[PDB]
């Protein structure tokens, strides 16, 4: 990295105001229908959101005991933004190491803990449940059949992207990116704090982003300097943040932090979701870093809209029968 992160954290220049500060009770389906979930949102308190979180003093070791000591986790090397892998016990050892003894800065942003004990300790905002394509569009008998708690693709029965635990040490930095498939993101600061820089997905900015990706100079060019308006904003302990489809963001961690969050597609900004998918295609993003079963899901969305509106099914007889059995439960 050749830019100075500390000047990016200190400057007053990222002074756009893109974020809407909301109350949880107002974050409902009617709000989504009216606004298209186009605006990033901050909930300074959880009242009215319908979230559930672990004990306030939950630790990384607690996460490890819920997911398993031997669970392989993807870890980011902050200096290179490259991925490595280790077990959750090894990750916990790292995390518990005093700061002045850690040889390198590593970050975990990708531990998906669905189908472990941890899963029932964390609930996302109720309203996300009413609109996530996984919950509302994917054949339910397939989702319910998932047993594997890792993100091994051969065992994956639906897009396993709903619930992640992020564990970040002071000094961590995740460089600018758009979440896979143009997914929207919810993000809850259980403990600690985060700094985000937000860049809106205008056609121009998305062109810049793609060209930056294709240049390979991500360590040299701080993308928030290349655009007309960027917002840097701090999330404090207990805040919930929702990031809309397409939004280009980077994140810095000023104190050891534990976050619960996750990703979702939805029906109100499909064009952006498709745009982002096509950027991933052109920039040759490896499958492993993409939304699993993306076009499969899109076919299921079409079928659900036609069925729900017209009562005509385009699922197989067997699939219809599986669905009817569940309707009778």
């Amino acid at each position: 990295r050749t830019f100075d992160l500390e000047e990016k954290l200190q400057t007053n220049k990222y002074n756009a105001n893109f974020v809407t500060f909301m109350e949880g009770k107002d974050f409902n389906v009617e709000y989504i229908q009216r606004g298209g979930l186009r605006d990033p949102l901050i909930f300074k308190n959880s009242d009215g959101l319908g979230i559930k979180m672990p004990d306030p003093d939950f630790t990384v070791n607690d996460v490890k005991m819920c997911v398993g000591s031997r669970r392989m986790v993807d870890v980011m090397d902050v200096n290179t933004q490259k991925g490595i892998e280790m077990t959750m016990a090894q990750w916990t050892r790292y995390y518990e190491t005093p700061e002045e003894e850690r040889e390198k800065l590593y970050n975990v942003i990708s531990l998906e803990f669905s189908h472990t004990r941890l899963e029932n300790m964390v609930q996302r905002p109720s309203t996300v449940d009413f609109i996530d394509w996984v919950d509302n569009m994917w054949p339910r008998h397939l989702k319910e059949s998932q047993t594997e708690s890792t993100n091994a693709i051969l065992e994956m029965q639906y897009p396993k992207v709903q619930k992640y635990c992020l564990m970040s040490v002071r000094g961590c930095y995740t460089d600018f990116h758009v979440d896979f498939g143009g997914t929207s993101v919810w993000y809850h600061i259980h403990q600690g704090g985060k700094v985000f820089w937000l860049i809106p997905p205008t056609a121009h900015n998305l062109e810049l982003y793609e060209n930056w990706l294709l240049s390979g100079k991500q360590g040299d060019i701080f993308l928030g300097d290349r655009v007309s308006d960027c917002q840097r904003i701090e999330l404090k302990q207990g805040y919930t943040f929702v990031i809309p489809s397409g939004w280009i963001h980077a994140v810095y961690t000023p104190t050891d932090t534990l976050v619960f969050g996750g990703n979702f597609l939805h029906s109100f900004n499909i064009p952006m979701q498709l745009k982002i998918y096509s950027i991933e295609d052109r920039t040759r993003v490896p499958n492993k870093f993409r939304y699993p079963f993306y076009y499969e899901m899109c076919w299921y969305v079409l079928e659900r809209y036609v069925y729900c509106i017209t009562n005509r099914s385009h699922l197989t007889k067997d699939f219809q029968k599986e669905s009817l059995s569940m309707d009778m439960e």
């Binding site: 993807d74 290179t80 933004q81 990708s110 993100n151 091994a152 460089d175 390979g216 991500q218 699993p292």
Partner: peptide, 13 residues
């Protein structure tokens, strides 16, 4: 060595 999907990570430098 099983292949994974839905790994969150920006691009490498």
């Amino acid at each position: 060595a099983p292949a994974t999907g839905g790994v969150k990570k920006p691009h490498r430098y």
